[PDB]
DNA sequence: TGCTCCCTTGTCTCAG
DNA sequence: TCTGAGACAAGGGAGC
C-alpha cells in the first residue's frame, strides 16, 4: 500500500452496479487473502471458507475472474521493512478450490498488484479487483475496490480531477511512504498534495529546499505557503540528499518484475461433483448445502 | 494555564445559573482582558477595551455580583525562563477610571493576577474567583467560576474538594501534573498528555517515585509500555526533577496579603454618562437605558 | 503578551 | 505578552 493514497483518490471513486460486470474478466488480487482470513476469525479452514464465499460472489455476477498470487519480495520492498503463518498447504487447497471451480490462476514473479497491472495492459483482463493502492503506481487502472463488503477507480479520473499522472503518483508515495520508501516525516495526504501542486516535481521541491538552506537570500521572496513549509520541514529535521527522489523507487514502479506472457486465460466450469466432495471433506459440508449454493451457480 | 488541565477538571464541574450569584464578592481576573479585546474585535477596533470592559462590568452587576478586579503586575522570572498591537498605559488608566466610576474596587497584583485572586479568597475578602486560567488551582485557588464571559458555553463551578474526591488530586498532585503536562512554569515531558500524566500520578504517587523507577532501570505491562514510550521520546530525568523552583513559585507566589476588606460603592450615573460620551459618543439617553436598572 | 478550536500528522492497540 | 479504526499526543495554524 501507499500511505493515505485511497484518501486522496477516494473523491474520484464512482459507484458501479454489480450486475453490469457480467462476462467481464477480472484480475483478482488474492496475494494476502489467506493471511487476512487467518487473522480475522474468532477458526480452522477459514481460508477455504473465505475463498469459497468470495468465489461464489464473483460467479454470482458473471465475473470471469483470474486469480493472482504473490511470488517473491522485491529488494526495495525488503530494506524498507527492516527499518500464525502461510503454509503451502493452505495455498494449494485454495488453488485447488479454484481449479475445481474452473477458475484459472497464476503466481506472479514478484508482487501480485504489479502482475494484475501487466495483464490489464496486455488486454488479458478488463478490470482489476484489489484493495491495494500500489496498483495505481504500477500503471494499473479500472480498479474495483470493496468488492467484498463497490467503488470504481481509474487513472483517467485521477488525472482529470486531481491533476495527478503516473509520475505524480510515484512521487506522492515518496512523500507519503509506501512498501518501497519511508516518506517524509510530516508529509501526509494534505501536505503531499500541496507540495506536488506547488513544486511540480520532487527534484524541483528539493532544490527549493537545499538552495534556500544554503543561501538565506533565496527565501526573501517566499510566500506564506513556502515560509510555513520551510519551518515545518526544518522542525522535522528533513534532509533531502542525492537519492531524493530515488531513481530506484521510480524504476521499481515503472519497470516492476512481471510476466509478459500474452497467452490468454482459459475458463472452465464449476465441477459440482468435485466441489461437493471437497466441501464435505475439508469442512464437513453435507451435499444439500453445497448444491443449494452451487446449482443456481452452474445454471444461473 | 496548565496544558490540558481544563479537560481533566471538566467532568468535576457543576453548572451554575447566574441568578444564584447575587451579592457574592467576586475576585475578577482581568489580567488579559485588554490584550484580548484588541486581538478579538475588528472589521483593530478603536476603544474596544472600553466597550469590552463596559459590557462585562454590566453583566456582573445585572446579577448583583460585587466584583473586585485584579490586574497583572509583573512576570515571574521562572515564567520568562520558560518562554525561552500593544496595551498602553492609557488603556489601563482608562478601564480603571471606568471601574472607579462604576464604584468598583480594584487592585494591581504584585505579580500574577491569578495568584493574587487565590490569595484574596484565602483571606475571605471574596467568595469566589472568576477566571478561566487553570493556573489558579495550583495557586491554591478554589470556588472557581469558568466561562463567565462566553458566548457558546455555560458557566462552570469548580472546587478543590470535588477534584480530590472525584479525581484524587490535591494541590501537590496538580503542581506535579503541570510538570508532566507543561505550563507557564515548565515545558513538561514530551509525549505525556492528560491521559498518561494522570495515570502516572495514580500509579507512582509522585514524580519522585516516578523518577526512581525510571532511573533505577535506565542504568509489568504498564511500566514496560511507559518505559518504551519514555525512551522513544528520549526523556531525561535529572536532579532538577521534580523542580523545587516550580514548586515554590506555585506554593509561594508573590501576593499582597493585606487583610483589609474592599469597599463597594454605588455607580455614578452623571460621571458614567460623561465618560462614555467623551470616549464613545454614547448619548445620555442610551447610557440611562443600561445604567438606571443597575441602581 | 491571549488562548482555544480544529486541522494535519505521527505512533500504537485492537480486533474483523 | 494483513489493513482499518481509534485512542493519544505534538505541533501548528486561523480567529474570536
Ligand atoms: Ca502492495
Ligand atoms: Ca496563568
Ligand atoms: K509521510
Ligand atoms: K506534555
- Beta strands B25-28; B128-130: pairing state: parallel
Count of beta carbons in the 10 Å neighbourhood of residue A135: 28
Report the SS3 class of residue B258.
Answer: coil
The CA-atom distances, in angstroms, between A165 and each of A7, A60, A188, A196, B259 are 17, 35, 19, 11, 75
Contact yes or no for A132/A30 (Cβ under 8 A): no
Estimate the share of chain B in helix, then strand, then coil, as percent rounded to the nearest 5: 50, 10, 40
- The CA radius of gyration of chain B, in Å to the nearest whole number, is 22
Distance B104 CA to C16 C1' (A): 65
Of B3, B1, B4, B10, nearest to B167 by C-alpha is: B10
Resolution expressed in Å: 2.7
Ligand 3 centroid – CA A169 distance (Å)? 14
Residue stretches of the annotated binding site of A for Mg(2+): 29, 70, 111, 113, 132, 134, 179
* Closest nucleotide relative to residue B191's CA, C1' based: D9
Distance between CA atoms of residues A282 and B5, nearest Å:
59
Which ligand is nearest to the Cα of residue A77, counting in written order?
Answer: 1
Joined together, the cell numbers standing for residue A196 give 506536488
**What experimental approach yielded this model?**
X-ray
DSSP state of B134: T
Cis peptide before A245 (omega within 30 of 0): yes
Joined together, the cell numbers standing for residue B182 give 507543561
Ligand 3 centroid – CA A3 distance (Å)? 8
Distance B169 CA to D2 C1' (A): 43
DSSP state of B129: E
Distance A264 CA to D6 C1' (A): 45
- Where are the domains positioned within chain B? 1-295
> Computed from CA positions of residues A286, A288, A293, A299, in that sequence, does the dihedral angle turn out positive or negative?
positive
Burial class (CB in 10 A: 0-12, 13-18, 19+), B288: middle
Contact yes or no for A60/A297 (Cβ under 8 A): yes
- The C-alpha cell 479487483 sits at A129
Distance A175 CA to D13 C1' (A): 21
The string of DSSP codes covering B18-65 is: GGGGTT-EEEE--TTHHHHHHHH-----TTHHHHHHHHHHHHHHHTT-
Of B112, B100, B126, nearest to B27 by C-alpha is: B126
Distance B232 CA to C8 C1' (A): 22
Which ligand is nearest to the Cα of residue B178, counting in written order?
Answer: 4
Of B30, B29, B6, nearest to B156 by C-alpha is: B6
B112 annotated to bind ligand: yes
Q: Which nucleotides of C are covered by protein (CB under 7 A)?
A: 1-5, 7-13, 15-16
Return the HEC string of chain A. Answer: CECCHHHHHHHHCEECCHHHHCCCEEEEECCCHHHHHHHCCCCCCHHHHHHHHHHHHHHHCCCEEEEEECCCCCHHHHHCCCCCCCCHHHHHHHHHHHHCCCCCEEECCCCHHHHHHHHHHCCCCCEEECCCCHHHHCCCCCEEECCCCCEEECHHHHHHHHCCCHHHHHHHHHHHCECCECCCCCCCHHHHHHHHHHHCCHHHHHHHHHHHHHCCCHHHHCCHHHHHHHHHHHHCCCCCCCCCCCHHHHHHHHCCCCCCCCCCCCCCCCCHHHHHHHHHHHCCCCHHHHHHHHHHHHHC
Ligand 4 centroid – CA A1 distance (Å)? 33
Contact yes or no for A69/A30 (Cβ under 8 A): yes
Which ligand is nearest to the Cα of residue B253, counting in written order?
Answer: 2
Please identify every residue whose CB atom is under 5 Å from ligand 3, which is an ion: A 177, 183, 187
Q: What angle do CA B110, B115, B118 make, to 5 degrees?
A: 125
Contact yes or no for B23/B64 (Cβ under 8 A): yes
Which ligand is nearest to the Cα of residue A186, counting in written order?
Answer: 3
Distance between CA atoms of residues A190 and A8, nearest Å:
8
Of A246, A3, A257, nearest to A113 by C-alpha is: A257
Count of beta carbons in the 10 Å neighbourhood of residue A195: 23
Contact yes or no for B183/B135 (Cβ under 8 A): yes
Q: Which nucleotides of D are covered by protein (CB under 7 A)?
A: 1-4, 7-14, 16
Cα B102 to chain centroid distance, Å, stands at: 24
Contact yes or no for A65/A165 (Cβ under 8 A): no
Distance B240 CA to D12 C1' (A): 29
Contact yes or no for B294/B58 (Cβ under 8 A): yes
Amino acid at each position: 500500500g501507499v500511505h493515505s493514497f485511497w484518501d486522496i483518490a477516494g473523491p474520484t471513486a464512482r459507484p458501479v452496479r454489480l450486475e453490469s460486470l457480467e462476462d467481464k474478466r477480472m484480475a483478482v488480487d488474492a496475494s494476502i487473502w489467506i493471511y487476512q482470513f487467518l487473522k480475522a476469525v474468532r477458526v480452522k479452514n477459514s481460508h477455504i471458507t473465505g475463498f469459497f464465499r468470495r468465489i461464489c460472489k464473483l460467479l454470482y455476477f458473471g465475473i470471469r475472474p483470474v486469480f493472482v498470487f504473490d511470488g517473491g519480495v522485491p529488494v526495495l520492498k525488503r530494506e524498507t521493512i527492516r527499518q500464525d503463518e502461510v503454509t503451502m498447504d493452505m495455498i494449494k487447497e485454495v488453488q485447488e478450490l479454484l481449479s475445481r471451480f474452473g477458475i484459472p490462476y497464476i503466481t506472479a514473479p514478484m508482487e501480485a498488484e504489479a502482475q494484475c497491472a501487466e495483464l490489464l495492459q496486455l488486454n488479458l483482463v478488463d478490470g482489476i479487483i484489489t484493495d491495494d493502492s500500489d496498483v495505481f503506481l504500477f500503471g494499473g487502472t479500472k480498479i474495483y475496490k470493496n468488492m467484498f463488503h463497490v467503488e470504481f477507480y481509474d487513472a483517467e479520473s485521477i488525472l482529470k480531477l486531481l491533476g495527478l499522472d503516473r509520475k505524480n503518483m510515484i512521487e506522492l508515495a515518496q512523500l507519503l511512504g509506501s512498501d518501497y520508501t519511508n516518506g517524509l516525516k510530516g508529509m501526509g495526504p494534505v501536505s503531499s498534495i500541496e507540495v506536488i501542486a506547488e513544486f511540480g516535481n520532487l527534484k524541483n521541491f528539493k532544490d527549493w529546499y537545499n538552495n534556500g538552506q544554503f543561501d538565506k537570500r533565496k527565501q526573501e521572496t517566499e510566500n506564506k505557503f513556502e515560509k510555513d513549509l520551510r519551518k515545518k520541514l526544518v522542525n522535522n529535521e528533513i534532509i533531502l540528499d542525492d537519492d531524493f527522489p530515488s531513481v530506484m523507487v521510480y524504476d521499481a514502479y515503472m519497470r516492476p518484475e512481471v510476466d509478459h506472457d500474452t497467452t490468454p486465460f482459459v475458463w472452465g466450469v464449476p465441477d459440482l461433483d468435485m466441489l461437493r466432495s471437497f466441501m464435505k471433506t475439508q469442512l464437513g459440508w453435507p451435499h444439500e448445502k453445497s448444491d443449494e449454493i452451487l446449482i443456481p451457480l452452474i445454471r444461473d
